[PDB]
Write an enzyme that holds these catalytic residues in place. Structure first.
Site, mmCIF file in Angstrom:
data_model
loop_
_atom_site.group_PDB
_atom_site.id
_atom_site.type_symbol
_atom_site.label_atom_id
_atom_site.label_comp_id
_atom_site.label_asym_id
_atom_site.label_seq_id
_atom_site.Cartn_x
_atom_site.Cartn_y
_atom_site.Cartn_z
ATOM 1 C CG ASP A 31 3.751 -3.386 6.883
ATOM 2 O OD1 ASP A 31 3.185 -3.452 8.035
ATOM 3 O OD2 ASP A 31 3.332 -2.684 5.955
ATOM 4 C CD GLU A 123 1.693 -6.570 -0.366
ATOM 5 O OE1 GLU A 123 1.895 -7.636 0.267
ATOM 6 O OE2 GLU A 123 2.431 -5.539 -0.278
ATOM 7 C CD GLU A 132 4.657 -0.680 -6.980
ATOM 8 O OE1 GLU A 132 3.898 -1.056 -6.077
ATOM 9 O OE2 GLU A 132 5.828 -0.994 -7.050
ATOM 10 C CG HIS A 280 6.857 -0.774 5.609
ATOM 11 N ND1 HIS A 280 7.847 -1.763 5.606
ATOM 12 C CD2 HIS A 280 6.858 -0.267 6.876
ATOM 13 C CE1 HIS A 280 8.434 -1.833 6.795
ATOM 14 N NE2 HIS A 280 7.839 -0.913 7.606
HETATM 15 N N1 LIG Z 1 5.734 -0.769 -1.041
HETATM 16 C C1 LIG Z 1 4.866 -1.196 -1.925
HETATM 17 N N2 LIG Z 1 4.737 -0.505 -3.058
HETATM 18 N N3 LIG Z 1 4.138 -2.326 -1.672
HETATM 19 C C2 LIG Z 1 3.109 -2.865 -2.620
HETATM 20 C C3 LIG Z 1 3.687 -3.574 -3.880
HETATM 21 C C4 LIG Z 1 3.919 -5.080 -3.642
HETATM 22 C C5 LIG Z 1 3.684 -5.859 -4.979
HETATM 23 N N4 LIG Z 1 4.512 -7.078 -5.106
HETATM 24 C C6 LIG Z 1 3.681 -8.288 -4.836
HETATM 25 C C7 LIG Z 1 4.249 -9.001 -3.573
HETATM 26 C C8 LIG Z 1 3.344 -10.175 -3.085
HETATM 27 N N5 LIG Z 1 3.144 -10.159 -1.603
HETATM 28 C C9 LIG Z 1 4.976 -7.110 -6.543
HETATM 29 C C10 LIG Z 1 5.399 -8.421 -6.922
HETATM 30 O O1 LIG Z 1 4.476 -8.903 -8.009
HETATM 31 C C11 LIG Z 1 5.207 -9.149 -9.038
HETATM 32 N N6 LIG Z 1 4.572 -8.676 -10.247
HETATM 33 C C12 LIG Z 1 4.366 -7.403 -10.561
HETATM 34 N N7 LIG Z 1 3.721 -7.343 -11.774
HETATM 35 C C13 LIG Z 1 3.538 -8.624 -12.215
HETATM 36 C C14 LIG Z 1 2.928 -9.220 -13.384
HETATM 37 N N8 LIG Z 1 2.337 -8.399 -14.470
HETATM 38 N N9 LIG Z 1 2.886 -10.550 -13.482
HETATM 39 C C15 LIG Z 1 3.408 -11.342 -12.524
HETATM 40 N N10 LIG Z 1 3.993 -10.835 -11.429
HETATM 41 C C16 LIG Z 1 4.052 -9.463 -11.263
HETATM 42 C C17 LIG Z 1 6.645 -8.368 -8.787
HETATM 43 O O2 LIG Z 1 7.677 -9.005 -9.662
HETATM 44 C C18 LIG Z 1 6.833 -8.455 -7.553
HETATM 45 O O3 LIG Z 1 7.492 -9.763 -7.136
#
Ligand SMILES: N=C(N)NCCCCN(CCCN)C[C@H]1O[C@@H](n2cnc3c(N)ncnc32)[C@H](O)[C@@H]1O
Ligand SMILES: N=C(N)NCCCCN(CCCN)C[C@H]1O[C@@H](n2cnc3c(N)ncnc32)[C@H](O)[C@@H]1O
Lengths: 342, 342
Positions: A31, A123, A132, A280
């Site tokens: 994206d 993000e 989420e 996205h």
């Molecule tokens: N299409 C969509 N929905 N796009 C939007 C969503 C994109 C969110 N993405 C972050 C990417 C960074 N650029 C999520 C990531 O954050 C991590 N993560 C989630 N919760 C966590 C927690 N409590 N502690 C530590 N890490 C945590 C997860 O494992 C994953 O790697």
């Protein structure tokens, strides 16, 4: 922790297994609007990073950490809970940044950081901003933030507006009407038709659309991430009052969001509006089971109420009424099971 | 129970939440080949149902139970573990069959039936026959079967055959080469390319294909459900020895399956072969990471080993060798995370 108390274990496993795939990482990195806007926000506010300590919450592949490094950060703690942490560490070694990026495996609610940080980057936005429930982890991480520290993104605006889309309404209604059949191979299914319509209309629709379908100026609800506490996001009440600019059947509400990175040098916006280039996240639409008829000049009023659930999502309640006629609609959506119509 | 011992709780909740949606039930009912063949097998073998007791394992909406009723069964116990059981009960009331169909909510490994049954009916087949491990519940239910009772389906055949599909094989490296990029927004991703190729090749591909790609007569592996024990399905070893009819590169193995309903009046087949009209099971293909060259008349030999895991699926290990040249290839695949290419 604060994380396992608000999260069914079943939902956490599925969640972190999904983000452990490189294919999902790729899909997000491709994206250009997302990635480019993050890079621009960070590099154009280089004064907010130069020789500072930064925390990257849910680093993933580690891309935002690399951007903070490009901007001159002394140190970046990149916290990541999936098996993606191991892949991030591989990238940090091969781009010669072990002196500046420290990958910490675990959830940000459970790990221990050696120092307080000058700025937090993440993000956290999902479909409709809130899906989420990653905003809660982002906000929880303020416990590591020095006084006068910044957050990127800094604010989020959810936008909603009523829309008309006969063809979308009819697709969904037609699928549900499978359950009207009095003699499906000799069996009468019709007693389940009500349940089937409920299930189809409970699903929000994720896709894009021409702004010609919107029937009013949007309404904005603002979250300031510097000031919000974790608990503000368990129950989010969004009152609205639309002035209709076109007459027609209103088939539901459309949602999109904007976030702002408010730096010292400049503010950068990342918008998922339908007037803007596609991301996205697309946009999200919540259909009403029965459309409401509104005349131009009428007021469509009501409430959008999001209640956090233990499957890392929200139950959404939308109640809307045309004030002039008293025509009312009430709907429950399940943001965890969206319909990807793209 | 026998069910919670072989199943991680996280996997069970995802599994039964998926089958609790009417839309999923509808998707399966709209497969005319599936539904029509079951109805045909049951109605054409009416002697095996007339005034008998029947157990329906994983009844879903309850459609097979209604067919057993149409065929003249005295009583049908319909066991269902998802929230779909409540919807089945509604259908049984509205089609006036509470005297003949009793819906029992729960897993067949944990519920109690009042009596032994004359015949068991179910749709336990998943992708490649074995995925979702519902054959174990089907076989477990033989504990309620009267001696000399029947099962529908009665036998299952898995078919394997080697295939050539250069474009599919190449798509995998195309997707992975996203990572072979020295400066993606200033970051070198190339060190993850290997891991990305590995991840793509662990996924079986679910879709259909022209039979022109198959390079040998298929090999059959037969499960006889009247004789099989639950334990026979924890480890399934499928030796194969193909006599190549076409020269070319072999890129992997294709799988499909057939089941037979062996009644007193007639045998009816339900086939998912690629020579037959399409069903919601399609076919499945497992790529080799290194393709093998075989000349027509050569022998491609080896083993397909399926090992049950606690996520209600199987780890698949395929080893093949061309006997004339000694060229070898192995892959490991994860049948829980398939790639839906169709
Ligand atoms: N299409 C969509 N929905 N796009 C939007 C969503 C994109 C969110 N993405 C972050 C990417 C960074 N650029 C999520 C990531 O954050 C991590 N993560 C989630 N919760 C966590 C927690 N409590 N502690 C530590 N890490 C945590 C997860 O494992 C994953 O790697
Ligand atoms: N490509 C696809 N879809 N392949 C797979 C075909 C899916 C067939 N479907 C039956 C509906 C049509 N007759 C599955 C149903 O079996 C139920 N179920 C599973 N295990 C159960 C257990 N241990 N005890 C009680 N019920 C159990 C499950 O809940 C669900 O309703």
């Amino acid at each position: 922790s604060v994380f396992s108390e608000r999260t069914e274990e079943s939902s956490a496993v599925q969640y972190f297994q999904f983000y452990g795939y490189l294919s999902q990482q790729q899909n997000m990195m491709q994206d250009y609007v997302r990635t480019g806007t993050y890079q621009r926000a960070i590099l154009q506010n280089h004064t907010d990073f130069k020789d500072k300590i930064v925390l990257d919450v849910g680093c993933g592949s580690g891309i935002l950490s690399f951007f903070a490094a490009q901007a001159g950060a002394r140190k970046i703690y990149a916290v990541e809970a999936s098996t993606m942490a191991q892949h991030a560490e591989v990238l940090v070694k091969s781009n010669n940044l072990t002196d500046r990026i420290v990958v910490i495996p675990g959830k940000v609610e459970e790990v221990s950081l050696p120092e307080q940080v000058d700025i937090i980057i993440s993000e956290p936005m999902g479909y409709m901003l809130f899906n989420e429930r990653m905003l809660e982890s982002y906000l929880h991480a303020k416990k590591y933030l020095k006084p006068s520290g910044n957050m990127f993104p800094t604010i989020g605006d959810v936008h909603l507006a009523p829309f008309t889309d006969e063809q979308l309404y009819m697709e969904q209604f037609t699928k549900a009407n499978f359950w009207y059949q009095p003699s499906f191979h000799g069996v009468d299914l019709s007693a389940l038709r009500g349940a089937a319509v409920d299930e189809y209309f409970r699903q929000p629709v994720v896709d894009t659309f021409d702004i010609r379908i919107l029937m009013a100026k949007s309404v904005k609800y603002t979250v300031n991430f510097l000031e919000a506490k974790e608990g503000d996001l368990h129950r989010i009440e969004i009152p609205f009052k639309f002035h209709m600019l076109h007459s027609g059947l209103v088939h539901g509400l459309a949602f999109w969001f904007d976030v702002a990175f408010i730096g010292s040098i400049m503010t950068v916006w990342l918008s998922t509006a339908p007037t803007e280039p596609l991301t996205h996240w697309y946009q999200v639409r919540c259909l009403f089971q029965s459309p409401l008829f509104a005349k131009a000049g009428d007021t469509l009023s009501g409430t959008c109420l999001l209640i956090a659930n233990k499957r890392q999502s929200y139950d959404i309640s939308i109640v809307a009424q045309v004030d002039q006629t008293g025509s009312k609609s009430s709907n429950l959506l399940d943001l965890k099971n969206p319909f990807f119509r793209y």
